[PDB]
Amino acid sequence: MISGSVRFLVNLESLNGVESIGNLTKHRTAPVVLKTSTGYLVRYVPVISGEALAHAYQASLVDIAKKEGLPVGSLSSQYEFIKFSTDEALKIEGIKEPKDYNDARRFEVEVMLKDVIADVGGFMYAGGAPVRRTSRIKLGYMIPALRGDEIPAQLEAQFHVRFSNKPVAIFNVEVSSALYTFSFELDEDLIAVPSTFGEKVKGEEELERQKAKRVKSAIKALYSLLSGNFGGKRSRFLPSMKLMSLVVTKTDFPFMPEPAHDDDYIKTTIMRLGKAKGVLNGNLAKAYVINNEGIEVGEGVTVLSTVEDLVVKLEE
């Protein structure tokens, strides 16, 4: 597994939107419970949904797969990830619906040999014989660090007008600035492996042949998420992003690094990784740390400089 925690600093930002009231475009906000010296409090803070991150990751994976010759679905060739949920998608792609439960595996393989997106991000088919496949990449909401007693985030509204020589043209846009943090998980040991239980079906040999390329493409696709290519309204509200801290852990056993809420979350996660490897009878545990804010790290830890080096090391 590959589990990562990342901290970003973004200023003058609007990438996620919600329903609009009047001539005002609103930014997504969520409640958070924060601990202060006086107890516990509830606050409302701007956030960014994880679905945008998933869409960006899937689009980058589509581009990489098309460049490298891996098969891509007809509907997924266009950036519309309906996958194989409805019958119209099946009719367009040309895959017969499953007949009974025993045929479900076959259907899964037929879906899995045509689109890498269905293999990596999972899919669902609802009907007489429903078929499920959980996504192999897991993300979450982007929340600013809940450090100290003051939340380092702010939101405001801005005024804009449209010019016209014959007045008969005024709108408002919400803009936020914060220090965001988010974590991600990706299990590469189950890529190109069927999930529905059953008997062997012809076509698994091709999946075994393409497993290495699929894993390499899935690992490469994380560069877009780690770089900052996500969100909307980038034509006129391009944000200013800067990486501050990054922790990546590669293990053969389940593990979850500490959230990037406290200033000391690298030493703790390294110690927890060591103890978890000791207690769970593991055989592989590696850590990579990128630091640009001069906080405590620890000892015996590999230190990188950019994200491309991390991607190359993960691929190798």
Binding site: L24, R43, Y44, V45, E150, I151, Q154, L155, E156, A157, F159, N172
Partner: protein, 126 residues
């Protein structure tokens, strides 16, 4: 006394809104999550009211007698019933905000109610 302070802050916000014809300061006040945002609006609304006072477009009056504030904006005449906050009301309100920013939302909700009722009555008479 806390409700009286909140009511006087709401009257200030309503006068500033009716005079400027802009909800932007009331929106900022009701969405405030910090003392900084609240204090910035309290300055900016009083600065708008100060211009209306200097132009004699904002004046204190009595109406049948209740204290009121007359506001003239764009040829419309509005009357807000009640007092404007004192310096002590602003200071006590800022102390209430330092304990709980909820009081800014309460004052914003009251201010918008005052302004909406006055705007509705003015449109009906026209």
């Amino acid at each position: 006394e806390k409700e009286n302070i909140i009511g006087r802050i709401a009257n200030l916000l309503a006068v500033g809104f009716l005079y400027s014809e802009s909800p932007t300061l009331v929106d900022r006040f009701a969405n405030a999550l910090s003392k900084e945002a609240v204090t910035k609006v309290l300055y900016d609304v009083q600065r708008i009211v100060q211009m209306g006072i200097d132009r004699s477009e904002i004046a204190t009056t009595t109406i049948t007698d209740y204290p009121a504030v007359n506001v003239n904006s764009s040829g419309a005449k509005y009357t807000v019933v009640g007092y404007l906050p004192t310096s002590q009301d602003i200071e006590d309100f800022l102390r209430m905000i330092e304990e709980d920013v909820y009081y800014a939302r309460k004052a914003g909700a009251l201010a918008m109610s005052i302004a909406n009722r006055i705007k509705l009555g003015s449109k009906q008479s026209k």
